[PDB]
């Protein structure tokens, strides 16, 4: 699974083409590789999950405002509604979903309408309904749930939280300098749930994701169907606001 095939939306295609001591925006993004014509057209992207034994995945949508310049007013009113009733409008981010290895402990406390299991595997999908129902005050517990892997020590989990704090510091620094407007982009967190792979890598993570063309975890920026480069127009404060709230949350973890 080296490559991912997304259905191409022109705006997202255009954003990847326009982009591709602070780290540059593109170093947070999947490597864009081209298009495939099936016609149906697909973006071909590097698979961020490649090389993980047991990837544990968190999708956080960024921004208070969840509609773009061109949003039809019917769905602009919908996106105001989503923002005002979730942590998006108050914190600048919301949990969109997770795909994680089940901790039996966790599982029992979580209501059945919040996840999908399976007899074929040790994974649960934690759904959008879970993310939308988080409050300002309980969302950080949602993020803790994410890292609460049954296979990892408290030491390794601590290490992971410190690693993403630092990536958040870096991504924040990137964003102060980037002249873009990204509507409904997500941060994608991934971490290795297989302790054998930790041993193989000797608990050594890499702050920045490896170059695909020329990790025990990663944080990436994805989903650019409502994003544009806006040179001269200054930094994306809508997005930065959610990053700032994530920094505060991760600093509380380490306190
Ligand atoms: N490069 C990638 N590698 C691995 N998984 C990806 C990649 N891009 C997207 N995904 C997966 O697809 C999910 C949603 O894709 P997204 O980019 O949000 O699409 P949409 O524009 O349809 O909302 C993410 O939660 C993630 O698990
Ligand atoms: Ca070893
Ligand atoms: Mn998305």
From Swiss-Prot:
Function in brief: Inositol phosphate kinase with both monophosphoinositol and diphosphoinositol polyphosphate synthase activities. Able to phosphorylate inositol 1,4,5-trisphosphate (Ins(1,4,5)P3) on both the carbon-3 and carbon-6 positions to synthesize inositol 1,3,4,5-tetrakisphosphate (Ins(1,3,4,5)P4) and inositol 1,4,5,6-tetrakisphosphate (Ins(1,4,5,6)P4), and then to subsequently phosphorylate and convert either isomer of InsP4 to inositol 1,3,4,5,6-pentakisphosphate (Ins(1,3,4,5,6)P5).
Known EC number: 2.7.1.127, 2.7.1.151
Subunit comment: Interacts with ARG80 and MCM1.
Domain of life: Eukaryota
Note: The expression of this protein is not effected by the presence of arginine. Present with 2720 molecules/cell in log phase SD medium.
Residues bound to Ca(2+): 199, 202, 232
SUPFAM superfamilies assigned: SAICAR synthase-like (SSF56104)
Cofactor list: Ca(2+)
GN (gene name): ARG82
Name this polypeptide is given: Inositol polyphosphate multikinase
One GO term of the biological process aspect: inositol phosphate biosynthetic process
EC class: transferase
Annotated positions binding substrate: 55-63
Primary residence: nucleus
Cellular component, GO annotation: cytoplasm; nucleus; RNA polymerase II transcription regulator complex
Family per record: Belongs to the inositol phosphokinase (IPK) family.
UniProtKB keywords: Acetylation, Arginine metabolism, ATP-binding, Calcium, Kinase, Metal-binding, Nucleotide-binding, Nucleus, Phosphoprotein, Transcription, Transcription regulation, Transferase
Annotated GO MF terms: 1-phosphatidylinositol-3-kinase activity; 1-phosphatidylinositol-4,5-bisphosphate 3-kinase activity; ATP binding; inositol-1,3,4,5,6-pentakisphosphate kinase activity; inositol-1,3,4,5-tetrakisphosphate 6-kinase activity; inositol-1,4,5,6-tetrakisphosphate 3-kinase activity; inositol-1,4,5-trisphosphate 3-kinase activity; inositol-1,4,5-trisphosphate 6-kinase activity
